Design a protein around this ligand. Structure first.
Ligand SMILES: [Ca+2]
Ligand SMILES: [Ca+2]
Ligand SMILES: [Ca+2]
Ligand SMILES: [Ca+2]
Ligand SMILES: [Ca+2]
Ligand SMILES: [Ca+2]
Length: 612
């Protein structure tokens, strides 16, 4: 018989555990050992809209879920699914008896509401999230019965199960129809009465504030928003809090092999900390049972973490990052600096900037020698490896860089020795970066000095998150600095190779807006990018794995020929930690947002061997 956490035995209002669970709960097979109930997991997030820290701790609860080796997905929220021979129809069978956190039924009505009334509603999302599209076209999503939902695409969509396992593909299970319909004008003609109580002026803002979206802080800022998550918000996230607390969902829909309703751990407490230096200190002091997101990407923290393992009572584990590059230069093909744009669009200008960089020095100084020079291409640990895309223009060659820049007409010099435009002033590139990402900032400081030898001025524009993203969406930057994805799975995140991501394809978000709107908005891309966008749509719609392989390789080939974005180093090891007493953490898991790590490791089966 199923059993429950002692904490839930305390609640006289709850139904018995066999009535709270689905008839067939998902049986979780723990990473290392069957666990024991109890305890509070201590972890950490930042203060300014770092809500993805909660999502990456508890896990997206999607229709499918990655396996630990990230090669495939398995049914997760769905008990099972079928794919039609032509790969156009996916039919998901849901777990009869499954309930939301409020005890009400989780059924096909919720998934159909999430898709048809939220995701595919053009007032809510003027451009539909591409996770659900093939060639810009939406699926027909229908209820078959109370526990069966069908997604019917107009072309083959082989990659849909994988998309459904990423954070961005979790909308189908994010919205309880009962609660959320109160805030939707198709359902509630008195919705305007909700505007004043929520401090909004229109219904999409009301929906975002109350029912939320994947990455909105409002996802974690209330206690009344129902979910199917393993823990539920009890002390909410907000603009100026110092901790967040979540407690177990009494209606969680999973058991372990002995029949225990999960999670094992009763509670998660997030410290909310503004400065990364304070997080380092608290982590080395042993105040966190897990930190696998904030400290690992700046390798300068690794010696400190390793040295303090005994003092803090934790074990460091190294994860392989899925990103192809730790600090990539996303050159803006649509920069509003028109004199600079005329150079940004020249292949040889981009080549020269790469040849003027000293990646061995960047590695030694900013990455402690633990990274390696790399451009933007997939790794040899992937079937998408392209030698040119990974390795072209990596070695410092200032003689050639300076000859190229001369040939491109940048021979007129200012009194400080810098090159100037043929009809303008100093060649000066504004690079936006998140100022808290100190290894990226140090990398930029090294490039700034290196590019002086080419007579090119790099201006570092470091800021907090909101200004960084607002500059990007406003097309207000010459270079944007952030990771290049695609080292391990280029097809999940192809944004460095083709401009399809509305916020992160920063070779031009205006090109991305053109792609996503079918050419109605944004800026029409050049011929090579339009070709890659058409190939991308062919790839998503491929009828067979072999066709998908050829089409996607063509995209990478063209991206290699164009050399639109410039890498510095591929990631060093990502250093994560867990308390010595915290069991069932998969220390072998890769690191990455598409897997929502560390939650890839199934936090609902983490447990404490001993408390303190
Ligand atoms: Ca009892
Ligand atoms: Ca695969
Ligand atoms: Ca059919
Ligand atoms: Ca697939
Ligand atoms: Ca050339
Ligand atoms: Ca090889």
């Amino acid at each position: 018989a199923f059993t429950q956490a002692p904490m839930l035995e305390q609640n006289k209002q709850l139904p018995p555990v066999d009535q709270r669970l689905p008839e067939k709960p998902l049986v979780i097979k723990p990473i290392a050992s069957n666990g024991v109930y109890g305890g509070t997991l201590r972890t950490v997030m930042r203060g300014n809209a770092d809500g993805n820290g909660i999502l990456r701790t508890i896990g997206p609860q999607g229709l499918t879920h990655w396996t630990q080796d990230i090669q495939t997905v398995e049914p997760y929220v769905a008990e099972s699914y079928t794919v039609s021979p032509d790969a156009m129809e996916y039919t998901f069978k849901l777990r009869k008896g499954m309930k939301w956190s409020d005890g009400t039924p989780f059924t096909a009505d919720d998934i159909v509401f999430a898709m048809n009334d939220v995701v595919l509603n053009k007032e809510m999302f003027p451009q539909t999230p591409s996770a659900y599209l093939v060639g810009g076209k939406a699926p027909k999503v229908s209820k078959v019965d109370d526990y069966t939902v069908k997604f019917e695409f107009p072309a083959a969509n082989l990659s849909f199960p994988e998309t459904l396992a990423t954070p961005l593909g979790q909308h189908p299970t994010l919205y309880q129809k009962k609660y959320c319909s109160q805030f939707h004008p198709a359902y509630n003609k008195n919705v305007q009465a909700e505007f004043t109580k929520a401090n909004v002026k229109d219904w999409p803002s009301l929906m975002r504030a109350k029912c939320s979206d994947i990455e909105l802080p409002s996802r974690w800022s209330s206690t009344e928003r129902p979910s199917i998550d393993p823990w539920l918000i009890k002390e909410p996230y907000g603009g100026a809090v110092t901790r967040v607390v979540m407690e177990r969902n009494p209606f969680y829909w999973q058991v372990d092999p002995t029949g225990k309703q999960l999670p094992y751990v009763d509670r998660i407490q997030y410290a909310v900390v503004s400065d990364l230096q304070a997080i380092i200190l608290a982590a080395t002091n042993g105040q966190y049972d897990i930190e696998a997101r904030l400290l690992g990407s700046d390798v300068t923290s690794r010696p400190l973490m390793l040295k303090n393992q005994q003092k803090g009572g934790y074990k460091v584990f190294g994860q392989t990052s899925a990103n192809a590059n730790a600090a990539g230069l996303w050159l803006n093909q649509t920069t509003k600096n028109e004199k600079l744009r005329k150079y940004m669009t020249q292949h040889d200008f981009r080549q020269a900037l790469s040849l003027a960089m000293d990646r061995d020095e960047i590695n030694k100084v900013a990455w402690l020698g633990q990274a390696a020079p790399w451009q933007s291409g997939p790794f040899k640990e992937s079937k998408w490896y392209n030698e040119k895309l990974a390795t072209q223009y990596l070695k410092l060659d200032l003689a050639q860089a300076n000859q190229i820049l001369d040939r491109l007409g940048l021979t007129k010099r200012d009194s400080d020795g810098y090159r100037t435009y043929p009809d303008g002033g100093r060649v000066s590139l504004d690079a936006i970066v998140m100022i808290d990402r100190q290894a990226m900032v140090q990398t930029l400081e090294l490039i700034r000095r290196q590019w002086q030898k080419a007579g090119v001025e790099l201006v570092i524009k470091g800021s907090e998150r909101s200004l960084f993203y607002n500059r990007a969406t406003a097309n207000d930057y010459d270079i944007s600095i952030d990771v290049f994805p695609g080292g391990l799975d280029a097809t999940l995140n192809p944004r460095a190779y083709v401009a399809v991501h509305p916020l992160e394809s920063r070779m031009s978000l205006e090109w991305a807006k053109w792609y996503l709107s079918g050419g109605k908005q944004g800026i029409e891309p050049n011929e090579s990018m339009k070709k890659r966008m058409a190939l991308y749509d062919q790839f998503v719609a491929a009828k067979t794995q072999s066709q998908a392989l050829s089409l996607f390789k063509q995209i990478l080939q063209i991206s290699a020929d164009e050399f639109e974005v410039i890498g510095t180093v591929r990631p060093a090891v990502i250093s994560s930690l867990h308390s010595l007493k915290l069991q069932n953490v998969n220390e072998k898991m890769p690191f990455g947002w598409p897997y929502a790590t560390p939650s890839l490791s199934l936090p609902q089966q983490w447990y404490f061997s001993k408390l303190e």
